[PDB]
Enzyme design. Sequence first.
Site, PDB file in Angstrom:
ATOM      1  CD  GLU A  37     -10.882  54.110   5.275  1.00 12.62           C
ATOM      2  OE1 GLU A  37     -10.570  52.920   5.066  1.00 12.62           O
ATOM      3  OE2 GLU A  37     -10.514  54.739   6.290  1.00 12.62           O
ATOM      4  CB  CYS A  51      -3.085  50.108  15.370  1.00 14.46           C
ATOM      5  SG  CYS A  51      -3.224  49.536  13.661  1.00 14.46           S
ATOM      6  NE  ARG A  72     -20.090  50.589  14.736  1.00 12.62           N
ATOM      7  CZ  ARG A  72     -19.215  51.032  15.628  1.00 12.62           C
ATOM      8  NH1 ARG A  72     -18.976  50.372  16.749  1.00 12.62           N
ATOM      9  NH2 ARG A  72     -18.563  52.166  15.389  1.00 12.62           N
TER      10      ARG A  72
HETATM   11  N1  LIG Z   1     -16.454  51.838  12.030  1.00 16.58           N
HETATM   12  C1  LIG Z   1     -15.663  52.032  10.978  1.00 16.58           C
HETATM   13  N2  LIG Z   1     -16.094  51.693   9.714  1.00 16.58           N
HETATM   14  C2  LIG Z   1     -15.265  51.898   8.630  1.00 16.58           C
HETATM   15  N3  LIG Z   1     -14.007  52.438   8.806  1.00 16.58           N
HETATM   16  C3  LIG Z   1     -13.577  52.774  10.045  1.00 16.58           C
HETATM   17  C4  LIG Z   1     -14.396  52.576  11.149  1.00 16.58           C
HETATM   18  N4  LIG Z   1     -13.724  52.991  12.245  1.00 16.58           N
HETATM   19  C5  LIG Z   1     -12.508  53.444  11.862  1.00 16.58           C
HETATM   20  N5  LIG Z   1     -12.401  53.314  10.501  1.00 16.58           N
HETATM   21  C6  LIG Z   1     -11.237  53.693   9.679  1.00 16.58           C
HETATM   22  O1  LIG Z   1     -10.381  52.584   9.486  1.00 16.58           O
HETATM   23  C7  LIG Z   1      -9.031  53.005   9.476  1.00 16.58           C
HETATM   24  C8  LIG Z   1      -8.124  51.928  10.062  1.00 16.58           C
HETATM   25  S1  LIG Z   1      -6.374  52.394  10.011  1.00 16.58           S
HETATM   26  C9  LIG Z   1      -6.063  51.194   8.691  1.00 16.58           C
HETATM   27  C10 LIG Z   1      -5.708  51.861   7.366  1.00 16.58           C
HETATM   28  C11 LIG Z   1      -5.717  50.911   6.174  1.00 16.58           C
HETATM   29  N6  LIG Z   1      -6.336  49.647   6.554  1.00 16.58           N
HETATM   30  C12 LIG Z   1      -4.310  50.689   5.633  1.00 16.58           C
HETATM   31  O2  LIG Z   1      -3.533  49.920   6.195  1.00 16.58           O
HETATM   32  O3  LIG Z   1      -3.927  51.263   4.614  1.00 16.58           O
HETATM   33  C13 LIG Z   1      -8.978  54.298  10.275  1.00 16.58           C
HETATM   34  O4  LIG Z   1      -8.231  55.263   9.575  1.00 16.58           O
HETATM   35  C14 LIG Z   1     -10.418  54.747  10.405  1.00 16.58           C
HETATM   36  O5  LIG Z   1     -10.595  56.003   9.793  1.00 16.58           O
END
Ligand SMILES: Nc1ncnc2c1ncn2[C@@H]1O[C@H](CSCC[C@H](N)C(=O)O)[C@@H](O)[C@H]1O
Lengths: 151, 430, 434
Positions: free
Chosen positions: B191, B237, B215
């Site tokens: 996260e 999504c 990344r």
């Molecule tokens: N490049 C990145 N690296 C790490 N996290 C990222 C990212 N780009 C977006 N995210 C985070 O990943 C989340 C995906 S939404 C998925 C929420 C979680 N997987 C669940 O189901 O409980 C987003 O809230 C965003 O904040």
Amino acid sequence: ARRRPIRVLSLFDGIATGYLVLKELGIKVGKYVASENIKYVNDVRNITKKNIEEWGPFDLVIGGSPEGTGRLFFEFYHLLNYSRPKEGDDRPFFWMFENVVAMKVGDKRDISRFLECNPVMIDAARYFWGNLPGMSVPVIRHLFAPLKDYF
Amino acid sequence: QSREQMASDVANNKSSLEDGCLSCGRKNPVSFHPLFEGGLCQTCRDRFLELFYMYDDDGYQSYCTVCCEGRELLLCSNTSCCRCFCVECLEVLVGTGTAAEAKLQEPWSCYMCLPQRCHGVLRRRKDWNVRLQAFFTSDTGLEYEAPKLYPAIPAARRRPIRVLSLFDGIATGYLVLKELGIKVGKYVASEVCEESIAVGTVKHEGNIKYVNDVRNITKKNIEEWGPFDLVIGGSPCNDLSNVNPARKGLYEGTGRLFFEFYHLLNYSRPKEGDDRPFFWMFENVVAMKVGDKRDISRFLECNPVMIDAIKVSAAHRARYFWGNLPGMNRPVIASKNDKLELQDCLEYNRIAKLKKVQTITTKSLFPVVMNGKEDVLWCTELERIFGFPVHYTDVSNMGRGARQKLLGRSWSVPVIRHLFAPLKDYFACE
Amino acid sequence: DEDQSREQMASDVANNKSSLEDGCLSCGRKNPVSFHPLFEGGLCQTCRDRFLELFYMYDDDGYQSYCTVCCEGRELLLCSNTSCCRCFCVECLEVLVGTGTAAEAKLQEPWSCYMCLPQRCHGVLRRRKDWNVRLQAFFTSDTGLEYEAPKLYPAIPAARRRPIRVLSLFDGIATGYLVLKELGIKVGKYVASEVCEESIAVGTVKHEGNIKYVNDVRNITKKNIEEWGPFDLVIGGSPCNDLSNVNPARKGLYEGTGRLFFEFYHLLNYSRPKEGDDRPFFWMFENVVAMKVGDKRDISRFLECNPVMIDAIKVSAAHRARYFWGNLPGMNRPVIASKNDKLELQDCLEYNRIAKLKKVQTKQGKNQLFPVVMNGKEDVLWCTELERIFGFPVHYTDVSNMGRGARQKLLGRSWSVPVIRHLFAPLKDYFACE
Ligand SMILES: Nc1ncnc2c1ncn2[C@@H]1O[C@H](CSCC[C@H](N)C(=O)O)[C@@H](O)[C@H]1O
Ligand SMILES: Nc1ncnc2c1ncn2[C@@H]1O[C@H](CSCC[C@H](N)C(=O)O)[C@@H](O)[C@H]1O
Ligand SMILES: [Zn+2]
Ligand SMILES: [Zn+2]
Ligand SMILES: [Zn+2]
Ligand SMILES: [Zn+2]
Ligand SMILES: [Zn+2]
Ligand SMILES: [Zn+2]
């Protein structure tokens, strides 16, 4: 010595210039599978794992993009992983990609990270890649000139 | 080849509707409606594959139930029914003169609110409830091989599940694992949001090793962090979902991060010759375009399943759940402790105007009344709907603006508990 | 003798020609009607009447708004040490200690106040060895008249006890109800007069609506009390908005929120019983310490009581002192902390959070931004930590989907569970327990 002929899994044949330069290089091919002598297979979306297992192995991959670049590049990568040798293999292997330098920097970082290799640049300029011993048709001939060492 | 003569031909008691396209008119069909009896053309079933589970901002169904199109749509006003019909669809099939009937008949009842018969040619299926889910689950793209059955590892030889996670959110995967009882001997996360890390740290006593952005993970990191036994993952999504007119596809936008799940899946999966279990998981919104439902399952080489939370919760949550978990295609059984109705999640001295709450977006009718006064839902009630413990997001001084956005993109706890149930056959629990 | 410069008295005490208790310590005038509670000296008529008001005034960033001695804001000089906030001004420092010391003290970085420093005769500012026990008595006695000691009601029989019919005027968030329920006293009725709709939700959802609400206090007549009576206890507390001297356009009593005192007085007159009775009856009141002495005199005259002073810092971890009127049995016992008291800031924080201070005071940047530091980035207190600081059970105010500002504002103007528990402890001797 005692080198079997080449078999190249080309891609984006277009005018099929790469085959012409390879033939002019003085070496023969065993089987060529192109997709826009050349044994056409399918469209780019209809190749499966068992297909490559049956017609493998392969010794060369070609890129090329003179629009969404990911659409072609990620299938290219997909295959590239398909054709790469597995563990416990010492067969020589090649790959190569072509892309115009006029492209996004983040794009460039992503493709360099995914290919796990540092890129190279050749002036006209075109972004270049490839795990191949060596350091525009003349550019093509210069690049695949040293290919005859192990073949 | 209009539908006008097609309806007349089948009205002569000599032909059936499955030979033509009900929502399109043309002949040469491919498959049938799961709501009625008939058939659709190939290019006309694709639009029904996407738009079926859409909902409008007014708490009602977005598009037509017959043709999935409309400039103007007559709207049913029954109890918790959202289906909206088309203007020209009605007169083609049931009969002429229905335009001025439902206009004055207040309230109007649609054909799935009343005991129906062959009104015109609207023959509703006897068991459309069961055949509708099979229209979304069991299609036929390339017939990939059955999931490999890893040998059932018995006890006294099971290591704690060395979970990995990408885009973890609020440690939804960790929460369910502790509920089941599976000892999490290590749990990496991926996260990047500042508030999401706060929730997963103070609530879990600092047992989560939050590391860095996705990344930046290189090839060397996995062998100094592994070996792993499971790779969770949920893509953002918002890249290509049928709500943003941007239409940034999987090959252009933040959908590129799907391959980063596949990229790190290759390093973590065991090398050739080893015989240890390795499970994985993926999920995305069902309302994606045509050219992504199979491409994502081609690279992954698997067949997606579908599970809806309306059978285990009081909300509308149905997503595509990839992976090769043991026994994942089994039917969705409900739980005895489930809060199957809205009135089991409200506060004291409050009563509701609905029974199942429709989907909620960044902007939150009003489903509750208290003391004979009209009110809306509270931020401490949404946690009960999604199965979360009460007073879970009460951290880091977020009001309703952030406790709602952060809760709108999480997984349903009783839904996830269904998939991970047979994982106790491979790892040490309790 | 009276209107002369401080130099004469400074020389006289320097030449042993006078005594400390002969002149005022802050202005030099004669007639020591009282004693300075921190040093040896005397106070005059016009000095101690502005030392009972401005001693407990704090700035918006957790410091003292006026210097410790002269209480006049001409030029300040702050004690840089933390856990202390008392400051000395320029004149109060230079004359009574030594000439030329102001510049050296300012250049002396960091600076420390003379009370932080070990006690010595740094001039003529000798520090009392028992300053606290006398400062505590400075705010409770020696002022006003000598009202007759309230008569204690006779010892109620143990068996003949009845549930208490409280009337919590200006309830707020059921602080008194929460204390009574936690204390273990059977409540048989509970009226409440609140017009804060959010507070109604807090008092309803948390306690299962056991309290019967009533609308605005300004619409209550005699017949309402006749129907609702009898009342075994009357409780009230004025909103300390316009009474405090913080706002420059202060109105005090007889105006605005001050008039609500008359409503409370009328409601207490109506609810108290008639002649020939034996029913126990008790009442209470509360207002901020920082207010005009005249208004305090009128309040103490109307009610015929001498208010006591309770400071929350002795059982809690906050700066809060407020006056207590009333009639309860033993309102001036010595306070003792409970065995489960969250006495210091460390016991009221989250996980992976560390407290730098020890007891928090009641422009929010680089000074108040650093009460708690997490991972090298100092941050502010959360609502869940304020609830723990104020003694309420955790997860109490989280209703009606309100965020940070509403929760902290609603929390800042309430009582404290331990203080009211100490006050209400003797009430188990008259009414049924558990
Ligand atoms: N490049 C990145 N690296 C790490 N996290 C990222 C990212 N780009 C977006 N995210 C985070 O990943 C989340 C995906 S939404 C998925 C929420 C979680 N997987 C669940 O189901 O409980 C987003 O809230 C965003 O904040
Ligand atoms: N005009 C008015 N009529 C009745 N109540 C009022 C009022 N103006 C303010 N109040 C109430 O008086 C309360 C003052 S807060 C003091 C009450 C108590 N000390 C406690 O908080 O527990 C506020 O909660 C407010 O709701
Ligand atoms: Zn069609
Ligand atoms: Zn239609
Ligand atoms: Zn309907
Ligand atoms: Zn004086
Ligand atoms: Zn001074
Ligand atoms: Zn000091």
